[PDB]
Design a protein around this nucleic acid. Sequence first.
DNA 1: ATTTACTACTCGTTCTGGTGTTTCTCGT
DNA 2: AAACACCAGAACGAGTAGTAAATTGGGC
Lengths: 94, 93, 253, 254, 268, 256
Amino acid sequence: MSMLVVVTENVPPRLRGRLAIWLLEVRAGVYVGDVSAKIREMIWEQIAGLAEEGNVVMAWATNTETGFEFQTFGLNRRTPVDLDGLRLVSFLPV
Amino acid sequence: MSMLVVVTENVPPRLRGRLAIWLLEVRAGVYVGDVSAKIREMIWEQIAGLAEEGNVVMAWATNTETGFEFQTFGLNRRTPVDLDGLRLVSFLP
Amino acid sequence: LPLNPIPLKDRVSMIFLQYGQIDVIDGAFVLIDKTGIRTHIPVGSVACIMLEPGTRVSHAAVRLAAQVGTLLVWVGEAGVRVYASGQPGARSDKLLYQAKLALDEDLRLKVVRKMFELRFGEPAPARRSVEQLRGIEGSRVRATYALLAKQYGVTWINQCISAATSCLYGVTEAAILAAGYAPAIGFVHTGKPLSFVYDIADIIKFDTVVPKAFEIARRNPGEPDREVRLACRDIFRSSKTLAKLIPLIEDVL
Amino acid sequence: SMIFLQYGQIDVIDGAFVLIDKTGIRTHIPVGSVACIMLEPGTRVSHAAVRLAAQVGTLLVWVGEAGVRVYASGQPGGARSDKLLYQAKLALDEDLRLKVVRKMFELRFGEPAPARRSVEQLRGIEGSRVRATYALLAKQYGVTWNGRTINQCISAATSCLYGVTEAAILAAGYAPAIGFVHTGKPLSFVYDIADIIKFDTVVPKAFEIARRNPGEPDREVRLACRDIFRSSKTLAKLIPLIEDVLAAGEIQPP
Amino acid sequence: LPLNPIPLKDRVSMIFLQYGQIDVIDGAFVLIDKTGIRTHIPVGSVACIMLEPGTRVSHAAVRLAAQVGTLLVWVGEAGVRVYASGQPGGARSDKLLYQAKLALDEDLRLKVVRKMFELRFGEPAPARRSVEQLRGIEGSRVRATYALLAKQYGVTWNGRRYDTINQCISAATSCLYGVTEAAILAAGYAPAIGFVHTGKPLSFVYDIADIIKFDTVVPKAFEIARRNPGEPDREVRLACRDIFRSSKTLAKLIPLIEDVLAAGEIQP
Amino acid sequence: VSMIFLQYGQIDVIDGAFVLIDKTGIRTHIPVGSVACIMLEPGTRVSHAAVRLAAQVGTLLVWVGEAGVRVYASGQPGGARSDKLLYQAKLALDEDLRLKVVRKMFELRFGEPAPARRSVEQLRGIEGSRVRATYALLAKQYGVTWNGRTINQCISAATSCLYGVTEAAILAAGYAPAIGFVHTGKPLSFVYDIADIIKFDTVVPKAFEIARRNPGEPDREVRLACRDIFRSSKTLAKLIPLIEDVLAAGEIQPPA
DNA sequence: ATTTACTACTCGTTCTGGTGTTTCTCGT
DNA sequence: AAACACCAGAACGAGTAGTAAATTGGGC
């Protein structure tokens, strides 16, 4: 069981509700909670399914070099980038 | 060493840059990283210092029942509420 | 997409809702109050939700809470349990297992003696019937209540004890249901709708829950209800109660 | 004794159950008057309502339209120890279970079950005729029948029946998981009782709707069954049936 | 508000920058490329940042990296270190003089080398052996260990040469030399004042790093070279990250340096 | 052998030689060999090939503020030459040699040799007395209100600026700023030693001159003043031989 | 040649208040 | 009566481009 963070943008109210069933919406589209690996991989199924043409990123705590991992869904100006195993995010200009 | 999350709104570019020195800005005003207790407490000084008329919330992983704690700075529609030791956030109209 | 309940141990223990109307906005639990402020409650994150007077639940609210596997408890004065709602039942084999044990006095005695053995650590005297054991049980409980009065210095408070135990009864019933057993079919306690709840809870009741009630009761603090709840909350967290409940029921049987 | 309250708030005025419908009052319920309250969508229960119901021993069940689907019920797990153990003993004993299954068969078709046939044998006979019964109804309504659109309708229909059937089992005070013909499933007992009256009205309506081939047959069947359960008073006749079925064990009930 | 460096152990190991211009926007490190895409790099999270050819750092960039305590390394072919920049002051006056006195004294210098030898292997060094003799023995063992690793992983070995396997070994060690130099600076010592290695601008870096290089870093390079991946640079770098993570290298470097110097039996 | 200050341009290598590309795209060819150290003022952007070339020829890169007023980062940190570091070290590790170095500093600071048989503690007392008097005199010479170390704000700004070129000089020489003789324990101990020698020459009196007037922004004014002095009076260029002269007083042979 | 403070202006999302429509993810 | 899909709006903050100002948070 490790910390979980979900940030959603331009997502239908359907998913925005679903995430509020397990996680805590501290800010607009920002959900924070502490779940397990099995539950986390279930939260992603909810995101991949209920989110249409909207961008969502989910970051969870691990024992990696960064101390955490993150995966994205949909397109956005801020896309993740691989730097020799290290994942960062880049800002795309138009 | 535990996970850290900082969400900023109406914050001057000074702090938005400063946070990107240690943390990873995954979304607009959303910073994620893994720091220690001592480092977490210095980032809050940066937030409390460089943010003057902006609202910021910081959530970090702990060994509480929720698994995490969160602290706020400034005013926002979503303010935290205490429910018998357990803290949640309410939506003010 | 379908929504299923997460394991009980991987959840918070209890939350207390006291005023406002409980509706379902965009598919999520919310608490709207008199002044119109809304509050979302992570229901699939909570093992059990206590509903105090002044709350008005909607139809969708009860429906949502059942699917996510959260027990709803309508609570009275000083946190006493009034009513409860949960999924319309749960697993047959686990239920028949419990049943057969209770239908046979020989097997029932085995279960009761184990409860005794777990509650006090020492085996019960041999050739002692269930009726006889309950008499002994009362004596030990009566004495334990008296001791706590001397250890913490109290005058033999009831509001604190009831409130604390009520919290334990909440998660205990939530555990029995999530496990798939029936809270009505007990072994030591019988005839009551929460017989099995009282059986399991009484075993670990005096470990930390009841003496803590005396600790809070030792002083004379404002709003004893809050003082007890956050205390019980820490117990369930520190002593990892929720994780220990499911194996305990199975261990007893 | 059971009532269906819909589209309103359940409060307690003058020491009695009430349903506020914007127009005020509209329904007064004495306390000994209702054994159990079914709550359809559109209802908002109050704390005082639930508090009163607990003091007096009233079962609260949240149902869909006309009991078509059950979502949550008060006093979960069970409410009476004796009613559960009664059902339990009946299913745990090879002698008692066979008696009950035979009664189910007899009630389902109207004719007594063969004496020299075991439950496994009974299940086989039951299976043979129902497949044929499905074929008959298909020819009667003139549809294209294969092995079990039509299947979608039947499925929707049975789901509706399982709602009121489970709603009856709960109101009766028994456990839906402890079955006799069906076992191992969490809703085994629901399937047993429902199969008895399944071909009475539920299944034939499914064939009727499938013949007309509606754009959204799922909804049409549910609302149809909804209407059936109300007019044909399905739920009201189910509870005595459940008690009658279990009574075949010749053991005294609570 | 003031900006200070966080402890080394609490950081990521290394990042590799390849093209684009490195400037400072709103007080933070960014990597803008030819196509205008920007990438923010947390500096006070990385022990050292490696700069490959095609990179163009700004003045504020070098300034910022120094303030946060992050080492900048301009690297060559297969990541070999070329140049490096860091806080001009830095270090501890006593810690520097401590290291100095140890290297200025022929008796103490030998003592320190013996500790390095003892730490390098499992056995203490033979007595009455001069620094010249010990280095000769060490070289023999290092050369022999390379041959052994060649047999264990099954590669075609001729000689350790610095100009596939040699590319991997150099790349792996380059990563280790990076964080090692980053550790020595943050600890407060001088990377130029060595004991086994002398005369080199990174003598002490080679001393400390050589001790634990054959532990997991160098043999890992042989594992990668056998497999012959399309991008051996990436394969080796990503490998080293895991090594530094699992073996808590950054956390282990600072005590190692202190332990080695302590063999002089002088209180720091 | 020499030293260069490059500002407001990009440091690259296009024809196999150092060039300084300007905003309008003017380049300026700089022979990398022949120059001992390159100072980079704000506004500069070094390229990778540039640094690599500078590394091959053995030229030190130091990131400085305007005219070396402030040091921010320097290439080959920790040190670059072992011998120059050990040279400085031995001087500070030997109490007898340390005294020799301090005496040289004293003689250079004032002009007259220090009294014989005086320890560092004894010498610092003399030094302090002279400094307070020099502060008082400057107060009389420029006519300001002095209460002992606005005026203090100017002096502090000035000395900070002086520490810049002084530290930058120590780096270019190849020595460590942490190993001092008069000052000890501080990470910039050696910086304070050399700077104190020439501080009252032009740096401090200029601070009084600005303090004599009353500008709205004394912080910038003093810094910009010191900047102009370091450029015009070529201070940093005069500093490097001085450091070598000071250390030579130990009567120990200096590194090649 | 950098970098930041400052300033409209563009653009994007969240949120709200208005109807129209449903009582609803099955098959044991 | 309760709840969602839907639509059109206001309201807010993030982001971009252009202009003007510095080359800077100090004291041994």
